């Protein structure tokens, strides 16, 4: 009778007008605060995703076979059951899953029965009894799983992660203040390319992270790293181009970063570094160098080697003296020096032909020079300056960036 009232209450017109898009650019139905699924859901055969939010004890019929365009499910606090032919259809059709489990029962055991799974987002609150999860160890059934984002307290890395060592390409954990241990599993990653260990309570770089051999993007955000020392073996990560180590407590960068000559994306913002090293600038391949909100006192003059640097965010730092060697590098496109400790701006800035971003807000300046008109790629919307200093510019210099 509840199912009949559900079919009467939610006409197909109401579900059609409920239709919208999700964060993955798919047609998603955000079914929120309901008793079950209506039978008029499956009349919208063009649907590509359903967001089920707090809809418990739901039994999915076989009529889901009409959802040919369906490739994603997002289960938010839903203890959902499925029927056998529907299970087979979603085994042969589904690609993306995202299940949140405020309670353990809200995580369904049926969802691991598929094999066409590519992307999984295992947000929730996992218990510390992680190795006991045979439901987790069923990810070996998935023969295409490449994205695995577990937003839960993952103290010990599961052997479920061991069973998906090869096919995985993106590995994301938000451990939320729990130390990540049992490193041999992350040693067993063979073909993993993106390791996203966000806030795994790592007191330093784990030896497991360093036993990776095919990594391309490493993120240790909100992990209280003490040092970057083992780098004599980062040379085996020639496939690595992205190093994400910001919002951390690192205080220095030794010369060892010279081992990786394929490093492009470097993140060291919001760190405890008080003086930028010159041997960091010795590497010239680095194109993205992020050091915003740091404690940097000054920039050594070896930064002229960093010609390929297209991003040098030194904004909101303690930097008082900026050397002229940085202005020799003309490829720097996104440069932010806002809220810094500078006194005057360098007149020689016109050699930066490719310079879209310039941010100088908050920093104390005496007089804006006319040489700010010398920048070619600069834009008035791209040149974030106060209105008072916008007044302190020549009218031709105003129009140089104001008129497109």
């Amino acid at each position: 009778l509840k199912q009949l009232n559900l079919n009467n209450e939610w006409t197909p017109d109401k579900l059609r007008q409920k239709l919208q898009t999700n964060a993955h650019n798919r047609l998603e139905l955000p079914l929120i605060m309901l008793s079950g699924l209506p039978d008029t859901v499956f009349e919208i055969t063009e649907l590509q995703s359903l967001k089920l939010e707090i809809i418990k004890n739901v039994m999915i019929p076989a009529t889901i076979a009409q959802l040919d365009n369906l490739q994603e499910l997002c289960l938010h606090q839903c203890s959902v059951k499925i029927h056998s032919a529907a299970l087979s259809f979603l085994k042969e059709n589904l690609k993306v899953l995202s299940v949140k489990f405020d309670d353990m029962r809200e995580l369904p055991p049926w969802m691991y029965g598929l094999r066409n799974l590519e992307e999984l987002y295992l947000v929730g609150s996992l218990s510390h009894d992680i190795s006991k999860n045979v439901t987790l160890e069923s990810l070996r059934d998935l023969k295409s799983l490449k994205i695995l984002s577990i937003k839960s307290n993952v103290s010990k890395i599961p052997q479920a992660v061991v069973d998906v060592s090869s096919h995985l390409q993106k590995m994301c954990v938000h451990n939320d203040g729990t130390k990540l241990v049992m490193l041999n599993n992350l040693k067993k990653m063979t073909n993993l390319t993106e390791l996203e260990l966000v806030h795994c309570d790592l007191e330093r770089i784990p030896h497991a992270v360093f036993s990776l051999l095919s990594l391309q993007e490493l993120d240790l955000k909100e992990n209280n790293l003490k040092s970057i020392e083992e780098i004599v073996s980062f040379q085996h990560l020639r496939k690595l181009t992205v190093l994400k180590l910001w919002y951390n407590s690192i205080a220095y960068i030794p010369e060892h970063i010279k081992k990786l000559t394929s490093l492009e994306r470097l993140f060291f913002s919001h760190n405890k570094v008080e003086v930028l090293p010159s041997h960091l600038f010795l590497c010239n391949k680095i194109r993205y160098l992020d050091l915003s909100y740091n404690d940097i006192r000054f920039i050594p003059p070896e930064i002229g080697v960093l010609q390929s640097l297209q991003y040098f965010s030194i904004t909101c730092n303690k930097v008082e003296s900026l050397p002229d060697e940085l202005y020799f590098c003309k490829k720097l496109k996104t440069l932010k020096i806002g809220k810094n400790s500078l006194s005057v701006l360098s007149p020689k800035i016109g050699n930066l032909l490719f310079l879209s971003y310039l941010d100088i807000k908050g920093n104390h300046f005496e007089v804006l020079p006319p040489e700010l008109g010398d920048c070619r790629a600069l834009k008035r919307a791209g040149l974030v300056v106060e209105d008072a200093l916008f007044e302190t510019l020549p009218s031709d210099v105003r129009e140089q960036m104001k008129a497109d």
Binding site: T11, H24, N25, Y288, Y311, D359, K379, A381, G382, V384
Partner: protein
């Protein structure tokens, strides 16, 4: 008693709030799972399209004389009996009838008496033993029929449409997996401007489309077209402007498509094409080049020659880098670059002005360049992108785009 009560409960104001609008911008009313049809529905005057779905054995009252704006009668699984004055009114007013039925006896027999009807949508199997097109042999009585949609699993195309197609202008046949033995029978059917053979499993383009000359919109969706080499003869079709060769098994494009200079929309999406020959890029009249969900790995620079291109949708491809010549065409209105492997989007997109919606979410895009904010008509609804990718733009440029969302 049920009919009278249904007339009583379905009040006028609740019907007014029940009124909606369709894709054709006509006032609409969907009657789904009722005992009969309310007379207060028939009291309406502003209604244009009434939708009769799952109505068991109802009779149309003559109060349809009030429904003057009524032009589209939508019959879904509805066995309708008809009153004679209402029959005359529908003969002189009703112009579009869609009939879906599960049994060949469910179709009303008074649809042949309609004379002002031009659009017919016979969805549901017309092919049955001794009822194979003999039931619809009365569409010879139909004279002004121009649109004839047939989602009916037809094994062979009827002889009755060969008789009727002198005046027919659109033939949308959906067999849902049954091949047509066309036998070049469209030669007597000379007035078609559109032909939509969808889900027919043809596996080859027949020659009946080639014998015709008046076609301007050709759709061959889901016909399992492995090879499309016949298109060299399509220069004979001097009026074609929309060659919708999508949802097929097309793995390559022959160079003779360069002879097709009259194409304006070339819908090749959801195909297996891996390389675009440059001869396809000769056609200056292409406006909607949708090559999404395909195997393209690179985009040729000759796309800059296609100045009339507006919506280039290469969604879910293998294109790693956009050439600068792509931004040579200044008429790009909707650059659907989503789900691709675009490493970085060049700043030349700041030169584009007609861009209204660009899709970059799901790419390998490292950061969003500042010049993307130079497009005037672009807004947040148009600029769909990941939030962290949005954060890479300057907060003044982000303020400009957030204002375009606001203003």
């Amino acid at each position: 008693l049920r009919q009278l009560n249904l007339n009583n409960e379905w009040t006028l104001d609740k019907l007014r709030q029940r009124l909606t609008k369709n894709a054709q911008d006509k006032l609409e009313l969907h009657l789904f799972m009722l005992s009969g049809i309310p007379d207060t529905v028939f009291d309406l005057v502003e209604l244009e399209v009434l939708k009769l779905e799952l109505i068991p054995d109802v009779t149309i009252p003559p109060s349809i004389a009030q429904l003057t704006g009524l032009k589209e009668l939508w019959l879904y699984h509805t066995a309708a009996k008809i009153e004679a004055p209402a029959l005359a009114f529908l003969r002189e007013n009703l112009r579009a009838l869609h009939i879906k039925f599960t049994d060949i006896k469910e179709i009303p027999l008074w649809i042949y008496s309609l004379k002002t009807l031009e659009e017919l949508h016979l969805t549901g199997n017309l092919s049955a033993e001794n009822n194979r097109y003999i039931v619809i042999d009365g569409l010879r009585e139909l004279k002004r029929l121009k649109v004839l949609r047939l989602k009916s699993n037809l094994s062979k195309l009827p002889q009755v449409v060969t008789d009727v197609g002198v005046h027919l202008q659109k033939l949308s046949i959906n067999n849902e997996g049954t091949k047509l033995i066309v036998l070049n029978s469209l030669k007597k059917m000379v007035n078609l401007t559109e032909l939509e053979l969808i889900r027919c499993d043809l596996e080859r383009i027949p020659h009946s489309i080639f014998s015709l000359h008046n076609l301007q919109e050709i759709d061959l969706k889901d016909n399992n077209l492995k090879t499309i080499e016949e298109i060299i003869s399509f220069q004979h079709l001097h009026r074609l402007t929309c060659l919708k060769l999508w949802y097929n098994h097309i793995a390559y494009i022959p160079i003779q498509i360069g002879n097709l200079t009259n194409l304006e929309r070339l819908y090749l999406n959801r195909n297996k094409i891996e390389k675009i020959p440059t001869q396809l890029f000769y056609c200056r009249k292409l406006r909607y080049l949708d090559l999404s969900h395909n195997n393209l790995t690179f985009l040729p620079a000759d796309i800059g020659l296609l100045q009339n291109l507006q919506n280039l949708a290469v969604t879910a491809n293998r294109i790693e880098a956009l050439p600068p010549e792509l931004f040579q065409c200044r008429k790009l209105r909707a650059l659907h670059l989503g789900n691709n492997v675009l490493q970085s989007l060049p700043s030349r997109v700041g030169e584009l002005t007609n861009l209204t919606q660009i899709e970059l979410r799901g790419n390998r895009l490292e950061c969003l360049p500042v010049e993307l904010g130079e497009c005037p008509l672009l807004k947040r609804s148009g600029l769909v992108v990941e939030e962290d990718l949005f954060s890479t733009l300057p907060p003044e440029v982000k303020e400009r785009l957030w204002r375009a969302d606001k203003e």
